[PDB]
Amino acid sequence: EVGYDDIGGCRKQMAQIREMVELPLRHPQLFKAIGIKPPRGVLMYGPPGTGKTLMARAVANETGAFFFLINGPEVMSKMAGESESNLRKAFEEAEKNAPAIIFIDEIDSIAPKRDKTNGEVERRVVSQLLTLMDGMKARSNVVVIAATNRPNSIDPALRRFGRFDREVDIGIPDATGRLEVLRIHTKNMKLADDVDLEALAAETHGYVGADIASLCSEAAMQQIREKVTMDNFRFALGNSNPSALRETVVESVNVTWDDVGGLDEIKEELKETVEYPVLHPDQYTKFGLSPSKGVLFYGPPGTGKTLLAKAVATEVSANFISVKGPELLSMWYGESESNIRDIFDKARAAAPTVVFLDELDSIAKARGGSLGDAGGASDRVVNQLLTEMDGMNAKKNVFVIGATNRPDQIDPAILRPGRLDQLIYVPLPDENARLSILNAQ
Amino acid sequence: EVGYDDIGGCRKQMAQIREMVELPLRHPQLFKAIGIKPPRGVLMYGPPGTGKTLMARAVANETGAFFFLINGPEVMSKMAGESESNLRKAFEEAEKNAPAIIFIDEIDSIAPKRDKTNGEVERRVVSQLLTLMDGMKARSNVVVIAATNRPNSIDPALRRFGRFDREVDIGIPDATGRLEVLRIHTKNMKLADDVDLEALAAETHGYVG
Amino acid sequence: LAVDEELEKEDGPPWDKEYHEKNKIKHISFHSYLKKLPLSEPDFRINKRCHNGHEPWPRGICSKCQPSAITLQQQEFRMVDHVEFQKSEIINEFIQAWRYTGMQRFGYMYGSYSKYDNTPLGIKAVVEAIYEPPQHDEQDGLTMDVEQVKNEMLQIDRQAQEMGLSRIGLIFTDLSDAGAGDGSVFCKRHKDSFFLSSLEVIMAARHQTRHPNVSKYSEQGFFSSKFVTCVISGNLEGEIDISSYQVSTEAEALVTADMISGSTFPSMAYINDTTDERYVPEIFYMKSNEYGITVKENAKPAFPVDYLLVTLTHGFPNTDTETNSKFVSSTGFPWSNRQAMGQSQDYQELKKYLFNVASSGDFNLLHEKISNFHLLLYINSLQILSPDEWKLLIESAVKNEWEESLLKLVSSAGWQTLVMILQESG
Ligand SMILES: Nc1ncnc2c1ncn2[C@@H]1O[C@H](COP(=O)(O)OP(=O)(O)O)[C@@H](O)[C@H]1O
Ligand SMILES: Nc1ncnc2c1ncn2[C@@H]1O[C@H](COP(=O)(O)OP(=O)(O)O)[C@@H](O)[C@H]1O
Ligand SMILES: Nc1ncnc2c1ncn2[C@@H]1O[C@H](COP(=O)(O)OP(=O)(O)O)[C@@H](O)[C@H]1O
Ligand code: BEF
């Protein structure tokens, strides 16, 4: 069995569960004559790549409690009588073998919000999860952990002090958090001396944590196919298909490494702005000032504009998210504004990262009246991305790369100098810049 | 066990629910020869997280009478029948040996509006809930107590005088109703006297107990 | 018990309903009932935790924690399927006590268990001998003192574990002789009348709650106790044939202690009420309407007992061949508590029965005169011999290859002083 060493990285979040289950049962004499009991429920939210079933078994095996997993959509049936007692018999089963962990997963179809009022079996399973957990027994034996991929779709009336009222955050593992992940999965079937594990962690940028655990089992299949080395992990890196680049595929995929750029007088400036806070984090805290956030390129189109977008992302250890110009702006009314909303919180959850904005003139018009060049005149999509740059939130390490053709429609509202830092202009390449670009191709 | 002091933290809505079930029992001689029956059904509503599941257990110790308790969707079992008869088993057991206090919970999920849902069990659960509250000279001993957070989702025929009237609103206590909640679940805890507790009454305001 | 683990290895599916109706089998077995299912004893008591906030003791029993209406169905399985005897003279000795005084008797059965091969994954119950407790007996029935006999059956059960014996059943007689010169008995228990009296179901069901059956698939370590109930009543036409039944484990492990009492009718029993001591649910059963069929006709004051018993088959071993019998020496010795009859004796009966037969003659007939059940309980209750000599007396009586164990028995100083104190006494 495995306990408290299954994943590295996010272990202060697992230590919060360690002081929630084990610490009551290790010293129960400290929790009598203290008054108020600890809470009895944790809602673990985040991307559903990690699964959370591998962390909940690490906690339950260390304390010795029972692990009785109940899947999400299996308690819902179309006969409408056993759906409210398949969950009720689970807590009746976990009452005998105290202590025990229930660990209900995928709370989207089960226990939804009653704002829609659609379906009688969906409105009663909220109340069945309601009506028992208030009278659920104390002293930390029938505790429940929740695994849900969206924390804003469950019922807000569910959380009254005792159902799920200890919120914890699980996001994308950062640098020096994915290194301890591959240390666990390579404890058996040891790699040779040629492959380095620290260079392996620089290749993974924004992976879900369980994807690089399956990357080790994929690269080990290449060694039995050869009959593990550095080239076996390199071939399994491109075939892993992470969630950041899963939704878009353009055949065939290209990954370049022999591009450094012939524009060297701005390459040291681009290393100064977005590459120095992600390499030297402690110096910006000892000076007490925020680092550089964004930059904008403008000039002639096709003159190394997209080449600067991919040469920077290959040199930084962060992932690359690219918008396709006027492709996220649909004719439908509402989700055209939401297409800016879902690409920035994904960038903030994958901090640090670099986003690329291209052909700014087709979306902005810079305020222009209530009139439009095509006729839609939707001034709310420019005000939405006006709010997503600074916001009222934590200052993340997100970087934005602006690219446009003509600086006439440049928007003076997107240009406050805290938003974009440098208004640099790219010229046509000269004769000395042309010799540095022919040998690189 | 909880009691009237452990539930303390509401004042105006506490005296309305206390005299509804204790005053006809501690002093039954004043209703007699007065011409009016006592009120027979409590329906307390409000925002979630207030003590609409713990008010009923609080006067489910202090009166010293025959308490009961029904959960929301456990009565709904798959038979052509017995989803209405288990409701009848909970009322015909509570008929004898006066007095009587019965608490039904989660009346927003079960018993919905009639013309707003499509389920043949839901047409029979609503009216069996009506008929046991007024049948053919019914409502002689029992006093029903409801608890929900969505009063608009229940049936409009459910809030009549014979079944659910004198409904009490349990709102967010902030005008010196928040401070009375602090003195209940801190007298059991060990508190070293180094600060005052009155400054915490105005620090946050969206707290609901 | 080694019998429970031997049937777990063999698979025999054995729970087929269409196969057992071909061979005229009512209920399948206990071990094939295990493999189809998670062995939980159904409880009818009130709860004290209740998973909610209402008080457990006065009132407040919710519908998720309430004993529902019992449909009162028969048990679909049996613990044992066939009880087997070992000698026709042990039954002939027990009915001989009725022939001398006319009134009824009572006794406990000693034996073991083994494999039954007719039924798939069945257990057969082999009895070995009959013990008789002290009793006071009338012509209609009998009920002895409760406490003073339970004190007596601790030490004789301590006296029975060295041979490999255990209390497995009980017997009680009901003859009702007609005229004693033109027939044996009447026909008291048949299809029209009662099969088992309800005053004896409470004595049969209480013996199972105190004799638990060890099961590893349960949650408390005990489930579906293995205790047979035998009765000597009589068949239809003219004989005194015996019958053997068992009580249902779904109710009689729980309901007998609180809400089961004896009525005035022999085919029914009186339902009790707790008046807020515990909760007693409603009992539903069926009958036949005069013109059609009824549905749910009686609530409170009636329930039959014949919904609650399962049938068993008795048997006697063949005369030409048998495996072992282990206890045939005379089967005519005076028993323990036949004080109403004349077989209640002292040192005079040892002069008349054996006197260590033909004192210096032989040992082959002596082995067939000392392996009696009530003989070894008598000479150990005198406790003249040493306890290590009494262990050797066990292997010299019930164990095979007794020849080298018998000569070392009589050559000791323990056996020499018994025949010296017997020759001087009467
Ligand atoms: N950071 C991590 N987060 C979650 N699981 C991890 C992590 N590192 C390693 N693992 C392990 O990798 C495996 C893959 O996770 P799992 O949720 O089972 O994947 P999937 O969702 O593909 O079924 C599990 O055994 C898990 O414990
Ligand atoms: N002098 C040059 N400056 C920039 N890119 C050049 C030059 N000569 C050739 N190229 C190449 O031409 C392509 C067009 O440059 P790029 O700005 O990436 O185009 P686009 O704006 O269409 O994406 C790139 O592959 C780039 O490397
Ligand atoms: N007077 C009160 N003021 C504030 N909180 C209270 C009060 N009485 C009970 N509570 C709290 O309410 C909870 C129990 O009832 P609650 O969950 O609010 O019921 P419901 O959700 O059914 O209204 C506990 O957390 C308890 O501390
Ligand atoms: F909060 Be509810 F009344 F259970």
Coordinates of C-alpha atoms and ligand atoms in Angstrom, one line a residue, chain A residues 134 157 160-163, chain B residues 6-10 47-55 105-106 147 173 177 180-181 184-185 208-209, ligand 3:
Chain A
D134 CA -26.8 17.8 9.8
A157 CA -27.6 26.1 0.4
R160 CA -24.1 25.4 6.4
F161 CA -21.1 24.9 8.8
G162 CA -21.0 21.1 8.5
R163 CA -21.4 19.6 5.0
Chain B
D6 CA -28.7 27.0 23.4
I7 CA -31.1 28.2 20.6
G8 CA -30.9 31.8 22.0
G9 CA -29.8 34.4 19.5
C10 CA -33.3 35.3 18.1
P47 CA -31.8 31.9 4.1
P48 CA -29.8 28.6 4.5
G49 CA -27.7 28.2 7.6
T50 CA -29.8 29.6 10.3
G51 CA -31.3 27.1 12.8
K52 CA -34.3 25.9 10.9
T53 CA -33.0 22.4 11.4
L54 CA -32.0 23.0 15.0
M55 CA -35.0 25.0 16.3
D105 CA -38.3 18.5 7.0
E106 CA -37.5 19.5 3.4
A147 CA -38.5 23.8 7.6
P173 CA -29.7 38.5 12.7
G177 CA -28.9 39.3 17.2
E180 CA -26.2 36.7 21.2
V181 CA -24.9 33.8 19.0
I184 CA -23.7 30.4 23.3
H185 CA -21.0 28.3 21.6
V208 CA -26.0 34.0 9.7
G209 CA -25.2 32.1 12.9
Ligands
LIG3 N1 -29.3 30.8 17.6 C1 -28.4 30.5 16.7 N2 -27.6 31.4 16.2 C2 -26.7 31.0 15.3 N3 -26.4 29.8 14.9 C3 -27.2 28.9 15.4 C4 -28.2 29.1 16.3 N4 -28.8 27.9 16.7 C5 -28.1 27.0 16.0 N5 -27.1 27.5 15.2 C6 -26.2 26.8 14.3 O1 -27.0 26.2 13.3 C7 -26.4 24.9 13.0 C8 -27.5 23.8 13.1 O2 -28.7 24.3 12.5 P1 -28.7 24.7 10.9 O3 -27.6 23.9 10.2 O4 -28.6 26.2 10.8 O5 -30.1 24.2 10.4 P2 -30.9 24.5 9.1 O6 -29.9 24.5 8.0 O7 -31.9 23.3 8.9 O8 -31.7 25.8 9.3 C9 -25.2 24.7 13.8 O9 -24.0 25.2 13.1 C10 -25.5 25.7 15.0 O10 -24.3 26.1 15.6

